[PDB]
C-alpha cells in the first residue's frame, strides 16, 4: 500500500559504495512529505524533477540505491562528475531524473580504532557506465609484470578501506547516501502520490 521508504533510509545496515545496494520499489503510493520534510539531511538535491511537485508526480518504476561514502565525496554523486567514486564506483547519467539525499552517520558507522568494514574502489582500468556495479577483487596490473594473484611489485589489491574514526573532520566522516531514480518507462505507471 505504501512505498518502503522508511525501510530504505532507517536501516540497521548500509552497504559499501562499491557494492551499493539497489532496491526496486513499485506498485505503491508514495508520500514524499516524510522524505522531503525530514531533519538532518546534509545534502538533498533533485535534478530531473522539482521536489515541490515531486509528491504529485507519477512514474513507471523507482529505484533506491543506498551506500556509504566520505564527507568530501558527497559532491561527486551529482551527474557529470569525476573522481575515484564517480568513475570507479557509482555513476549517474546526465539525463538523471531523481534525487540524491545524504546525512551524517558518524555515530553509527565509525568505530574507535578504525572502521575497516567500509570500502571503496580505488583502482580500475576503465570508467564504468551509469548504474553499473563491480564487486570483483581481481588485482589491478600496473604494467609489464602480470600480477597473477600476487600483490606488490606494481600490483595492488583494488579496494581501499575508508577507515572511519570518531575523531575525524566532517569531510573525512562517513555519510549515508540514498539515490532515488525514476525509471519512467514506456509501460503502465504504478507509483505516485
Amino acid at each position, epitope marked *: 500500500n505504501l512505498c518502503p521508504f522508511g525501510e530504505v533510509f532507517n536501516a540497521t545496515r548500509f552497504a559499501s559504495v562499491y557494492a551499493w*545496494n*539497489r*532496491k*526496486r520499489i513499485s506498485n505503491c503510493v508514495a508520500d514524499y512529505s516524510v522524505l522531503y520534510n525530514s531533519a538532518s539531511f546534509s545534502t538533498f538535491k533533485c535534478y530531473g524533477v522539482s521536489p515541490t511537485k515531486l509528491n504529485d508526480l507519477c512514474f513507471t518504476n523507482v*529505484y533506491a540505491d543506498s551506500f556509504v561514502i566520505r564527507g568530501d565525496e558527497v559532491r561527486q554523486i551529482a551527474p557529470g562528475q569525476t573522481g575515484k567514486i564517480a568513475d570507479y564506483n557509482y555513476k549517474l*547519467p*546526465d*539525463d538523471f531524473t531523481g534525487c540524491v539525499i545524504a546525512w551524517n552517520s558518524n555515530n553509527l558507522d565509525s568505530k574507535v580504532g578504525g572502521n575497516y568494514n567500509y570500502l571503496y574502489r580505488l583502482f580500475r582500468k*576503465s570508467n564504468l*557506465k*551509469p*548504474f*553499473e*556495479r563491480d564487486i570483483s577483487t581481481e588485482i589491478y596490473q600496473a604494467g609489464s609484470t602480470p600480477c597473477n594473484g600476487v600483490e606488490g611489485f606494481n600490483c595492488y589489491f583494488p579496494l581501499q578501506s575508508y577507515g572511519f574514526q570518531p575523531t575525524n573532520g566532517v569531510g573525512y566522516q562517513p555519510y549515508r547516501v540514498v539515490v532515488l531514480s525514476f*525509471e519512467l*518507462l*514506456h509501460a503502465p505507471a504504478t507509483v505516485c502520490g
Partner: single-chain antibody
Amino acid sequence: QVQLQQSGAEVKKPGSSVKVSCKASGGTFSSYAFSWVRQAPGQGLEWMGRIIPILGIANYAQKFQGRVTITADISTSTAYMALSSLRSEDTAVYYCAKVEVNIGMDDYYYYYGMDVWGQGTTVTVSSSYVLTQPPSVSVSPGQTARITCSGDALPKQYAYWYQQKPGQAPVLVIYKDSERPSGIPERFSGSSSGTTVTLTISGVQAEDEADYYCQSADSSGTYVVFGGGTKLTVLS
C-alpha cells in the same frame, strides 16, 4: 565453454505461429541470460528480445508489439522464443545467443552482451534510436582499418562487436566498449571517445574479411539496437 543447439528448420503459412528452442549444454543455466536475433535474408542483424530465466524477466523490441513472447525452462535448460501472426517479412534466420549477465541478491541486474551464439534456425513463410555505422570500408592487406559506430546513447551504454563471416553465425570479438575475449587474437582492439566508438585491427589479414555489427542498448537500456552493418573487405 558452453554450446547451444537450436531446433531444426520450420515452414509455416502467413498467420501461423513458430516455436524455436535452443538447448544450452554446459555451465549452469540459472547463471546465464538469453536473447534472440533475427537475420533477414541478405540483410543485417535484428534483435527481438532477451530474458533472464532465474528472475523470469523478459523484454521485447517495440516493433514486435505482442507477437513475440520469450520464455525458458530451467528444468530442461532450454530457451523458447515464439512468434505469432507470421508474415512474409518475418522470413529470416533466427539466432539464439547467450547474454553474459550480472544478477544481484538485491534487485539489481546488468545485461552486458552476447558472447555465444547458436548454429541458427531458418524459418520460411510466404503466400527510433539507431547506431550509424559506415556501410563499407576497404583497407590494404598490410595496413590497419578503423570502423566507427555513432549513437547519442554511447556514454550511457556499452558497445559490442560481432564478426559475421558469410554463411556463418556471428562471433563476438570485442566487448564492453574495449575488451579482449580469450578467443579473438591480439590484433583486435577497441576504443570509445564521447559518442564515438571504433574497432581497430592491427595489420589486417585477409582472414579478417567479414561484416561487422556494433550492438548497444537504448538510452534507457531497455532495448538493444544493432548497427546497419559494415563490410570490411581487404583490397588486394
